[PDB]
Amino acid sequence: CDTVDLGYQCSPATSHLWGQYSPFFSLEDELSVSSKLPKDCRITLVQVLSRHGARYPTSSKSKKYKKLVTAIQANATDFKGKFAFLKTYNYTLGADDLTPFGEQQLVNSGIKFYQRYKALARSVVPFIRASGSDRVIASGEKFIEGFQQAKLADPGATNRAAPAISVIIPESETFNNTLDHGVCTKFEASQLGDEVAANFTALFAPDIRARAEKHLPGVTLTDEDVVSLMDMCSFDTVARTSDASQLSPFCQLFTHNEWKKYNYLQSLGKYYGYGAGNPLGPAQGIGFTNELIARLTRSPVQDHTSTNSTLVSNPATFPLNATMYVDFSHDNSMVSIFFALGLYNGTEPLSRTSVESAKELDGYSASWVVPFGARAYFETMQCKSEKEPLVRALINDRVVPLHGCDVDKLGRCKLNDFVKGLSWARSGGNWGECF
Ligand SMILES: *[C@@H]1O[C@H](CO)[C@@H](O)[C@H](O)[C@H]1NC(C)=O
Ligand SMILES: *[C@@H]1O[C@H](CO)[C@@H](O)[C@H](O)[C@H]1NC(C)=O
Numbered sequence: 001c002d003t004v005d006l007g008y009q010c011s012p013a014t015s016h017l018w019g020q021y022s023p024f025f026s027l028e029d030e031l032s033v034s035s036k037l038p039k040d041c042r043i044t045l046v047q048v049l050s051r052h053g054a055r056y057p058t059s060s061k062s063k064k065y066k067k068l069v070t071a072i073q074a075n076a077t078d079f080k081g082k083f084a085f086l087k088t089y090n091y092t093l094g095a096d097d098l099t100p101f102g103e104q105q106l107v108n109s110g111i112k113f114y115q116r117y118k119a120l121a122r123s124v125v126p127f128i129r130a131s132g133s134d135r136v137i138a139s140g141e142k143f144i145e146g147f148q149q150a151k152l153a154d155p156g157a158t159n160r161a162a163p164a165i166s167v168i169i170p171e172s173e174t175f176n177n178t179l180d181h182g183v184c185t186k187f188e189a190s191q192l193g194d195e196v197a198a199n200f201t202a203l204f205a206p207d208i209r210a211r212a213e214k215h216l217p218g219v220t221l222t223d224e225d226v227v228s229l230m231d232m233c234s235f236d237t238v239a240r241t242s243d244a245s246q247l248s249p250f251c252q253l254f255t256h257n258e259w260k261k262y263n264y265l266q267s268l269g270k271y272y273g274y275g276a277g278n279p280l281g282p283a284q285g286i287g288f289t290n291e292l293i294a295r296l297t298r299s300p301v302q303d304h305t306s307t308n309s310t311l312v313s314n315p316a317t318f319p320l321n322a323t324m325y326v327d328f329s330h331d332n333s334m335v336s337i338f339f340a341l342g343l344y345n346g347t348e349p350l351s352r353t354s355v356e357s358a359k360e361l362d363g364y365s366a367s368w369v370v371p372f373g374a375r376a377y378f379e380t381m382q383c384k385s386e387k388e389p390l391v392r393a394l395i396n397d398r399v400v401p402l403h404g405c406d407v408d409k410l411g412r413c414k415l416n417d418f419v420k421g422l423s424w425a426r427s428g429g430n431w432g433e434c435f
C-alpha cells in the first residue's frame with residue numbers, strides 16, 4: 001500500500017482525508033510543476049524537515065479512545081449495520097510510539113532521500129538532529145536505516161559512514177527548542193485553535209451523532225466522541241497490520257463527504273492553532289527559519305526566539321558547512337515553520353464555517369502539509385542558466401512556490417532574494433508578544 005516514491009495509496013479517497021493522521025502521500029504535480037531536478041542544475045545543499053511516522057495515539061488520547069470503545073460496548077443493546085464490529089472490537093492500541101507501519105514509512109523516507117539526492121548523498125554524511133520525543137528520535141533512526149540501506153546498495157557511494165543523530169533537542173517548557181514549541185508563554189496559553197475546532201465540530205458532528213446513536217441503542221455520544229470515532233479510523237488502520245494493508249472498520253462508519261469535513265476540521269486545528277490563523281502561530285517557526293537561513297548562507301544564526309544560543313553558536317551542534325541537514329520534528333512545529341517561511345502566503349484565512357479544499361486554499365491542508373511521515377526538502381542548486389544559487393521548497397513532493405521573492409517558472413528564487421524576503425522571521429516576528 002505504501003511506497004518509497006509515492007507514499008500511501010490504498011483507499012486514497014478516504015486515507016488522504018485524515019489531516020495529520022493521513023500517512024504521507026505524494027503531491028508531486030498537484031497544483032505544482034515537476035519536482036524533478038531541472039536540466040543543467042546541481043543540488044548544492046538540501047535541508048530535510050521530517051515529521052515522525054505513523055504512531056499510536058498519545059497516551060491521553062489512547063486512554064480517551066479506550067474509554068469510549070469500552071463505554072459503547074457496555075451500553076449498546078445492539079450494534080447495528082456498519083457498527084456491528086463494535087460488538088467484538090478489542091482496543092489494543094498503545095501510546096505514543098511508532099507503529100511497525102510508521103517505522104517503515106521512515107525507512108522509506110530515508111531511501112527516498114538517498115534516491116532523490118544521490119549525486120550529493122554519495123559523498124555526504126548528513127548532519128542530523130531530532131527533537132527529544134521517543135517517536136521523533138525513533139523516526140530519525142529509521143530514516144538513517146533507510147538512507148544507509150540505499151547508500152550501501154549504491155556502487156557509486158564513496159563516503160559510507162552512517163550518520164548519527166548528533167543533537168537530541170530537549171523538550172520542555174524551559175528549553176529553547178526550534179523543533180518543538182514550549183517557551184512562548186502567551187502562545188502556549190492560547191485556546192483559539194481548540195475553540196475554532198469545537199465550533200466547526202458543532203456544525204458537522206450532530207448529524208453523525210444521530211446516525212451512530214441510531215445504530216447503537218443505549219449509547220449516548222458527544223460531538224467529541226464522534227471525532228474520536230473518526231480519529232480511530234486512521235489510528236486503527238496504521239496499527240492493525242504491519243503494512244497498513246487493511247482499512248480499519250471504523251473508516252466506513254463515515255461517508256466521503258464526512259471525511260472531507262473531518263479532514264477540514266484537522267486543517268482548521270492546525271491553521272488556527274499553529275499557522276497564520278493563530279496570532280502567535282508563525283512565531284513558533286521563526287527559530288528554525290533563522291537556523292535554515294544560517295545554513296543556506298553558511299552564516300552564524302541570527303535569532304532571539306526559540307533557538308538555544310549555546311546549541312547554535314557551537315560548530316559541533318550547529319555546523320554551517322554540512323551540505324545535507326536532516327531534522328526530525330512534530331506536525332505542529334512544522335506547520336509554524338512553513339508559515340514563518342511564508343510558504344503558505346497564498347492561502348487566505350480558513351472559513352471557520354465552510355469546508356474549503358486544499359486546492360481552494362492553494363495547497364494548504366493538514367494532510368497535504370503534515371501527514372504522518374511528512375517531509376519537506378529545502379534545496380539550494382547551481383544551474384548553468386543562473387549565476388546565483390537558486391532555492392526550491394518541496395513539501396511532500398509538491399513544489400511550493402516561494403513567497404517574498406521573484407519566483408521563476410519552476411518555483412525557485414535566487415538565494416539572496418529569498419533570504420531578503422524572510423524579513424519577518426529575521427526580525428523575530430511578533431515573538432515579543434510571547435511575554
Ligand atoms: C541551552 O542549551 C544548553 C546545553 O544543552 C543548556 O544548558 C541550557 O539550559 C539551554 N538554555 C535554554 C533556555 O534552552
Ligand atoms: C464560535 O461560534 C460562536 C457563535 O457563532 C462565536 O461567537 C465565536 O466567536 C466562535 N468562536 C471562534 C473562536 O471562532
Ligand SMILES: *[C@@H]1O[C@H](CO)[C@@H](O)[C@H](O)[C@H]1NC(C)=O
Nearest residue numbers: 176304305306307308309310
Ligand atoms: C531562550 O529563548 C529566549 C527567547 O525567547 C531568550 O530570552 C533566551 O536568551 C534564550 N536562551 C538561550 C540559551 O538561547
Ligand SMILES: *[C@@H]1O[C@H](CO)[C@@H](O)[C@H](O)[C@H]1NC(C)=O
Nearest residue numbers: 341342345403404421422424
Ligand atoms: C507572509 O505574509 C505576512 C503577512 O502579510 C508577511 O508579514 C510576511 O513577511 C510574508 N512572508 C514572506 C516570506 O513573504
